[PDB]
Design an enzyme around this catalytic site. Structure first.
Site, PDB file in Angstrom:
ATOM      1  N   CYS A  94       0.826  -1.204   0.000  1.00  0.00           N
ATOM      2  CA  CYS A  94       0.000   0.000   0.000  1.00  0.00           C
ATOM      3  C   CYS A  94       0.865   1.261   0.000  1.00  0.00           C
ATOM      4  CB  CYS A  94      -0.926   0.004   1.198  1.00  0.00           C
ATOM      5  SG  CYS A  94      -2.076  -1.350   1.134  1.00  0.00           S
ATOM      6  N   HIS A 119     -10.067 -16.510  -2.887  1.00  0.00           N
ATOM      7  CA  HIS A 119      -9.207 -17.642  -2.546  1.00  0.00           C
ATOM      8  C   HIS A 119      -9.915 -18.984  -2.636  1.00  0.00           C
ATOM      9  CE1 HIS A 119     -11.712 -17.406   0.916  1.00  0.00           C
ATOM     10  NE2 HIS A 119     -11.212 -18.550   1.352  1.00  0.00           N
TER      11      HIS A 119
HETATM   12  C1  LIG Z   1     -15.144 -13.551  -0.686  1.00  0.00           C
HETATM   13  C2  LIG Z   1     -15.103 -14.355   0.616  1.00  0.00           C
HETATM   14  N1  LIG Z   1     -14.208 -14.028   1.569  1.00  0.00           N
HETATM   15  C3  LIG Z   1     -14.147 -14.704   2.732  1.00  0.00           C
HETATM   16  C4  LIG Z   1     -15.000 -15.765   2.954  1.00  0.00           C
HETATM   17  C5  LIG Z   1     -14.865 -16.467   4.295  1.00  0.00           C
HETATM   18  O1  LIG Z   1     -14.627 -17.825   4.127  1.00  0.00           O
HETATM   19  P1  LIG Z   1     -13.283 -18.422   4.847  1.00  0.00           P
HETATM   20  O2  LIG Z   1     -13.311 -18.021   6.289  1.00  0.00           O
HETATM   21  O3  LIG Z   1     -12.048 -17.933   4.128  1.00  0.00           O
HETATM   22  O4  LIG Z   1     -13.366 -19.904   4.701  1.00  0.00           O
HETATM   23  C6  LIG Z   1     -15.932 -16.114   2.004  1.00  0.00           C
HETATM   24  C7  LIG Z   1     -16.894 -17.294   2.228  1.00  0.00           C
HETATM   25  N2  LIG Z   1     -17.794 -17.631   1.398  1.00  0.00           N
HETATM   26  C8  LIG Z   1     -18.634 -18.808   1.624  1.00  0.00           C
HETATM   27  C9  LIG Z   1     -19.652 -18.602   2.742  1.00  0.00           C
HETATM   28  O5  LIG Z   1     -20.703 -17.807   2.271  1.00  0.00           O
HETATM   29  C10 LIG Z   1     -19.328 -19.168   0.308  1.00  0.00           C
HETATM   30  O6  LIG Z   1     -19.031 -18.557  -0.745  1.00  0.00           O
HETATM   31  O7  LIG Z   1     -20.172 -20.102   0.270  1.00  0.00           O
HETATM   32  C11 LIG Z   1     -15.977 -15.406   0.832  1.00  0.00           C
HETATM   33  O8  LIG Z   1     -16.900 -15.715  -0.172  1.00  0.00           O
END
Ligand SMILES: Cc1ncc(COP(=O)(O)O)c(/C=N/[C@@H](CO)C(=O)O)c1O
Ligand SMILES: Nc1ccccc1O
Ligand SMILES: Nc1ccccc1O
Ligand SMILES: [Cl-]
Ligand SMILES: [Cl-]
Ligand SMILES: [Cl-]
Ligand SMILES: [Cl-]
Ligand SMILES: [Cl-]
Ligand SMILES: [Cl-]
Ligand SMILES: [Cl-]
Ligand SMILES: [Cl-]
Ligand SMILES: [Cl-]
Ligand SMILES: [Cl-]
Ligand SMILES: [Cl-]
Ligand SMILES: [Cl-]
Ligand SMILES: [Cs+]
Ligand SMILES: [Cs+]
Lengths: 253, 395
Positions: free
Chosen positions: B61, B85
């Site tokens: 940044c 991710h």
């Molecule tokens: C863009 C993004 N950042 C963080 C997370 C957080 O997930 P972790 O803690 O990294 O495993 C998610 C999660 N998504 C799940 C639940 O709705 C899902 O898509 O079905 C996410 O989509």
């Protein structure tokens, strides 16, 4: 767990299998459920399998999922379930009473406290649906310490290690979800096997006894009568009467 | 009987009906085999690099830390194929499925990112994909649902129970217990029964491995802390893993505070829930006093999981990692700040992690510190939400 011992010896003397209905406690309401259960015993149920309403019943299919929902919509809590169970025990001193639990309810207020409360109200056995043999030790120990039988599921994809595990650690009955598997359970001195998961007509009760099982458990089929008659309690109780008497009559042969 | 310990200390386990244990044992053995197989590692790396775009950049940044002694890097998982991710570990799990001879994929999703990730991986590797999604989520995320269907996946709305991620998780489990001979359950976070917490970490640890190499190359030392939002725990544990034995490196996980912890409308079970047993694991949960599972509220859909991965609960209990919460409004402020200061639109989920790094630097602006935020996705998907919020507040 003595009640299962006594039940099966009596049934053996009568050359009968066991017919065991399952219902969800508090479905459709508390008073309705209590009357359902008394009708089940009156119509000839040998034991009872009772479900405690839970937010996410994984191992349960569609008909019981709606029974669970109806008991939820009735505000039936675990505490009210324990009160119902004490009354059911006080009405029916000899019939074996088995609970179908999910792990979080047993864990929620302490595992040992849960089984202590089961002992106090007169429960004979507990099956925790989402606890496998491999996780069962703390539940088994708390159950036995409070004279509760721990019920294990023997699934279709069981193998010989599992059969020996189930035979070693289970008490009361084995929950059997074929003819060779009952043979091994008997050879392994397992708790008498009750077949579940498919029992919807008298022919299947007779088939299970003929196969060597000690009886059969009927779930969905019983609860479907409740759902089908929610507007007519009198009709509901009449259909449960006729269905249970027929299923029980089928366990003689 | 398992090859690996299913617990992280007191947390985790395999709390599934007996019918599912052979599926879990199969999966654990296939994973342990795959980890020792150079051909699996080569195919996984080939996909990660040439299909998903790894390695991802580590961006310094330039403006956001002005006026402080904080240096802040962003690990740019937002540039990965799919925009988050989630893609990393679905590629590894899709190869595991193929290792096991499976031709079908079962997946759950709440916000839709893991559903879209499962669908794109299944399209590439020739697996038939079916995704369970709570009907409420299906109505709320019709763009991600359309993405999934474009890629050929079957999307199954789940009406049972609360019609949200919990019920979708349960339906996917019912299906798998009948279909696991040919189908693999592609669980989308570092939670659920063993071996999933272990598999998802290992198939996300390239995040932190890359970060470590990149930060050493660029700054000649390790970070003072790595920071990551915590929905179920996969992006955070993926960033944390390679630093766990580097005990000088702080590990900070950020749960959603929602409308405020004291309101009860949040998604922070690790610090403000109660340990329970659900979704196959012993872990902190949002639950009622009677043991019923509650919902995780957050402005960010992806932080909607009512529990947390067992390794995070374990790392917290022993003091190796610290967990904090960030409210909707702080996450939104960080979202706006990154847009204007760095030209990067972050996912609202990861905006929670950025919000905590911004708090760290603003609370102690003369403190010299080297921070890495895991930017786990891009926030293109969030611009309609942010638009309607800013408009509701007359901005
Ligand atoms: C863009 C993004 N950042 C963080 C997370 C957080 O997930 P972790 O803690 O990294 O495993 C998610 C999660 N998504 C799940 C639940 O709705 C899902 O898509 O079905 C996410 O989509
Ligand atoms: N067959 C089997 C063996 C061990 C655990 C669960 C099972 O279904
Ligand atoms: N843009 C994009 C988003 C999700 C999945 C695949 C994609 O190409
Ligand atoms: Cl009696
Ligand atoms: Cl306990
Ligand atoms: Cl335990
Ligand atoms: Cl025995
Ligand atoms: Cl611990
Ligand atoms: Cl290797
Ligand atoms: Cl350091
Ligand atoms: Cl939410
Ligand atoms: Cl650890
Ligand atoms: Cl430590
Ligand atoms: Cl807020
Ligand atoms: Cl717009
Ligand atoms: Cs600076
Ligand atoms: Cs969460």
């Amino acid at each position: 767990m003595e009640r299962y011992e006594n039940l099966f010896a009596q049934l053996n003397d009568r050359r009968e299998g066991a017919f065991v209905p399952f219902v969800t406690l508090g479905d459709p309401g508390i008073e309705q459920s209590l009357k359902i259960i008394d009708t089940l015993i009156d119509a000839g149920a040998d034991a009872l399998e009772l479900g405690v309403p839970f937010s996410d019943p994984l191992a349960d299919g569609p008909t019981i999922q709606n029974a669970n929902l109806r008991a939820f919509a009735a505000g039936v809590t675990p505490a009210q379930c324990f009160e119902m169970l004490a009354l059911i025990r006080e009405k029916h001193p000899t019939i074996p009473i088995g609970l179908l639990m999910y792990a979080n309810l047993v864990f929620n207020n302490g595992i040992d406290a849960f089984y202590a409360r089961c002992e106090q109200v007169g429960v004979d056995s507990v099956l925790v649906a989402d606890v496998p043999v491999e996780e069962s030790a703390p539940f088994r120990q708390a159950a036995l310490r409070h004279n509760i039988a721990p019920i294990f599921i023997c699934p279709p994809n069981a193998d010989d290690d599992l059969l020996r595990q189930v035979a070693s650690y289970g008490r009361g009955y084995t929950y059997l979800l074929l003819h060779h598997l009952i043979e091994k359970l008997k050879e392994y001195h397992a708790a008498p096997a009750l077949q579940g998961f498919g029992i919807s007509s008298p022919e299947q009760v007779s088939a299970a006894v003929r196969a060597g099982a000690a009886g059969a458990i009927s779930g969905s089929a019983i609860v479907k009568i409740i759902e089908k008659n929610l507007a007519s309690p009198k009709q509901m109780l009449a259909e449960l009467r006729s269905f249970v008497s027929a299923m029980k009559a089928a366990s003689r042969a | 009987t398992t090859l690996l310990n299913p617990y992280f200390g007191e947390f985790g386990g395999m709390y599934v009906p007996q019918i599912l244990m052979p599926a879990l044992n199969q999966l654990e053995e296939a994973f342990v085999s795959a980890q020792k197989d150079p051909e699996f590692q080569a195919q996984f790396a080939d996909l990660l690099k040439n299909y998903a775009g790894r390695p991802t950049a580590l961006t310094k940044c330039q403006n956001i830390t002005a006026g402080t002694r904080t240096t802040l890097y962003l690990k740019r998982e937002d540039l990965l194929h799919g925009g988050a991710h989630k893609t990393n570990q679905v590629l590894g799990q899709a190869l595991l499925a193929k290792r096991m001879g499976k031709s079908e994929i079962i997946a759950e999703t709440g916000a839709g990112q893991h559903g879209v990730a499962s669908a794109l991986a299944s399209a590439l590797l020739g697996l038939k994909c079916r995704i369970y999604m709570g009907a409420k989520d299906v109505e709320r995320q019709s763009p991600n649902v359309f993405r999934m269907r474009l890629m050929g996946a079957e999307v199954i709305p789940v009406h049972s129970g609360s019609a949200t991620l919990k019920d979708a998780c349960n339906e996917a489990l019912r299906d798998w217990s009948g279909s696991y001979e040919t189908a693999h359950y592609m669980l989308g976070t570092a939670a659920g029964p063993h071996p999933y917490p272990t598999i998802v970490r290992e198939f996300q640890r390239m995040i932190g491995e890359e970060t470590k190499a990149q930060i050493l190359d660029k700054e000649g030392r390790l970070p003072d802390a790595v920071i990551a939002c915590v929905g179920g725990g996969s992006n955070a544990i993926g960033m944390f893993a390679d630093f766990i034995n580097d005990t000088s490196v702080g590990l900070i996980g950020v749960e959603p505070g929602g409308h405020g912890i004291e309101t009860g409308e949040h998604g922070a079970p690790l610090k403000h829930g109660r340990v329970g047993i659900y979704f196959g694991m012993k872990a902190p949960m949002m639950q009622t006093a009677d043991g019923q599972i509650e919902e995780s509220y957050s402005i960010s859909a992806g932080l909607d999981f009512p529990s947390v991965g067992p390794q995070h609960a374990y790392l917290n209990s022993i003091g190796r990692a610290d967990y904090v919460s960030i409210t909707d409004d702080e996450a939104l402020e960080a979202f706006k700040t990154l847009c204007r200061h760095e030209g990067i639109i972050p996912a609202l989920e990861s905006s929670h992690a950025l919000a905590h790094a911004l708090k760290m630097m603003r609370e102690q602006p003369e403190k010299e510190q080297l921070l890495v935020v895991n930017l786990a996705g891009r926030g293109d998907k969030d611009i309609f939400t942010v638009h309607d919020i800013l408009k509701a507040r007359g901005e």
